[PDB]
Scaffold this active site. Structure first.
Site, short mmCIF file in Angstrom:
data_model
loop_
_atom_site.label_atom_id
_atom_site.label_comp_id
_atom_site.label_asym_id
_atom_site.label_seq_id
_atom_site.Cartn_x
_atom_site.Cartn_y
_atom_site.Cartn_z
CG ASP A 214 -1.86 1.18 1.31
OD1 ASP A 214 -2.62 1.23 2.30
OD2 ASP A 214 -1.86 2.01 0.38
CG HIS A 215 2.88 3.89 -3.41
ND1 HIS A 215 3.69 4.83 -2.82
CD2 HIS A 215 3.50 3.51 -4.52
CE1 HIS A 215 4.77 5.00 -3.57
NE2 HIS A 215 4.68 4.20 -4.60
#
Lengths: 422, 247
Positions: A214-215
């Protein structure tokens, strides 16, 4: 044919996949050598077989490595949520590792649910293996509670079982990363070559590992460093010392090195020197002590002569073939078979010193009998040994009971003397 | 342990990643020989050493090649927007190349911002190298203005520094494509072989390059042709004549 509503567990799977559309994700891919895994896993499974234990798998080893890597890079365990309408970073207390278990159901449709191994950051390899097998065992008997499906912080999946090279999977809400393990096989451009030719070149096997994250909370540099650490561990001296220590295997693990050229002193010469070393000094590492005890004040002899590095050999030589000059009643043999036989003859429960004898006929007589091995006894013989052991221990205990203080100089601890003398 | 609100530059990074969920993207992957790069780079660095100059890197060379390729295939520079509630294609005036600079901060946390090299389509290799080093130099001294962070049309990232083989990155709003450069190393099935044996066979080293693009304005065929051109340039006579002449 036609349309049909989705019901049951399948409806739950559909809903969660729709929810997951609100996570921005990226992926990293890395390929890693896998030769040392194959070698050292075999060494561990040989120890378990003699002790009538079980069998470890590649998922166990990669699983443990993943845990160690997450400890080294803690950001990989975090997640994102919106609480009171503000963005928030979530830092958990423990590392709970989710396993993707594919289990068929009563109907005959496969359906997967992720179960958790909890509090993993305070475990050694022995503890880890037990927990893993616990979850798997209870799943087959159908004895998993609702608590086992909660609190996962990081997940592991294995598409390489079927033979997929790698994948790009989905991330589910409440976690930060998912790790995938691909096929452990030769590349497809080598799948028609001969064993002889591959052995000459020095071609190994791969494993490809992926990281989907998850960025909003994990950056690319961190994900890269995570995979670099995992790559280093699976080829590291200190990593395999831990595993060997915990499983009680007495040999030094195989080490990682480059293949060396057949120049100068020939390799056949080096294999002959290894045979001589074991015959001469193999007793120094034999399993002859019932206790796991080393006396603190005593010097420890040098036994660097018994590892293949000192004779300029490497893991890449294990499947090549050499001239051994009548060893084992054969003119030719592989290095794997040579090591096996030497270790069976000179490093188990009997250690022998006989190479200092000057007469050739004496030496040959002893050498031939030690390498043939101990013959298997009959059932009658076995029962006779048990009678004698019983007699020894029973006699001592009787005297202990009836005459407590009196001096007798007991044989307890050394009851095998009676069957030896007999 | 526990919960803690996101503040500062990190909050900005989080918001933009959420905005980027409204871009449909696809990816292409290609592997390329890298032997001629190693050789010719060495030849250039030998000349600079005698003349007491500096040293060029692989990112410089691949960067320049990327620029030449975008000129050959201009569609890779376009982007999408909705203006007055109608779909619209945007065709910029210049090629502004964004570099992903990983810079540590005063606190001790790494945070990345993309700076731009502007008006790149009217440069030779000498000019390009100067501009590149200018941006990098000012970043370390902390002398970048707000103008340097605006007007990017196409980006370049380098996950191969750490040793990743390839990646599938995110595309940010206002651009059409992002290019990624992977590890320059032997494949992992050859990482235990001897130098002598590899030399006999004739085994070289790789580089893997990726292209992630917005599918509303760029089609797959164009992305493929872009990567094919880059592959040809890095093994072309005329390309290296330019670089040698300029240095």
């Amino acid at each position: 044919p036609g349309q049909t509503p989705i019901r049951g567990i399948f409806k739950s799977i559909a809903k969660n996949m729709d929810i997951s559309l609100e996570i921005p994700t990226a992926t990293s891919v890395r390929d890693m050598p896998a030769r040392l895994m194959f070698e050292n896993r075999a060494m561990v499974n040989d120890q378990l077989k003699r002790t009538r234990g079980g069998k470890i798998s590649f998922t166990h080893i990669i699983g443990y490595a993943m845990v160690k890597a997450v400890m080294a890079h803690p950001d990989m365990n975090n997640s994102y949520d919106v609480i009171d309408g503000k963005p928030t970073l979530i830092v958990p207390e423990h590392i709970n590792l989710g396993l993707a278990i594919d289990l068929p159901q009563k109907d005959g449709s496969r359906a997967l649910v992720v179960a958790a191994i909890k509090e993993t950051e305070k475990m050694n390899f022995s503890e880890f293996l037990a927990a893993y097998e616990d979850i798997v065992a209870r799943s087959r008997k159908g004895k998993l509670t609702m608590d086992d499906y909660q609190g996962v912080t990081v997940s592991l999946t294995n598409p390489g079982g079927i033979g997929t090279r790698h994948s790009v999977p989905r991330l589910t809400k409440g976690q930060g990363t998912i790790i995938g393990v691909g096929s452990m096989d030769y590349p497809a451009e080598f799948q028609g070559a001969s064993e002889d030719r591959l052995a000459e070149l020095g071609v190994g096997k791969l494993v490809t590992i992926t990281s989907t994250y998850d960025h909003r909370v994990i950056q690319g540099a961190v994900s890269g460093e995570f995979l670099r650490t995992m790559s280093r561990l699976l080829t590291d001296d200190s990593f395999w010392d831990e595993i060997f220590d915990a499983m009680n295997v007495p040999y030094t693990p195989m080490r990682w090195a480059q293949d060396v050229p057949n120049t100068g002193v020939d390799k056949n010469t080096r294999v002959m020197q290894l045979i001589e070393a074991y015959r001469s000094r193999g007793h120094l590492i034999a399993d002859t002590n019932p206790l796991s005890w080393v006396q603190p004040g005593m010097p420890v002899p040098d036994h660097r002569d018994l590892d293949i590095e000192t004779h300029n050999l490497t893991i890449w030589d294990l499947d090549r073939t050499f001239n051994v000059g009548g060893f084992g009643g054969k003119e030719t043999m592989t290095l794997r078979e040579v090591l096996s036989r030497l270790r069976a003859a000179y490093t188990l429960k009997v250690g022998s010193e006989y190479t200092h004898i000057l007469d050739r006929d004496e030496r040959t007589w002893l050498q031939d009998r030690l390498e043939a091995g101990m013959p298997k006894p009959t059932q009658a013989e076995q029962k006779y040994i048990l009678q004698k052991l019983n007699a020894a221990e029973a006699f001592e205990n009787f005297l202990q009971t009836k005459y407590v203080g009196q001096k007798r100089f007991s044989l307890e601890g050394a009851e095998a003397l009676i069957p030896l003398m007999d």
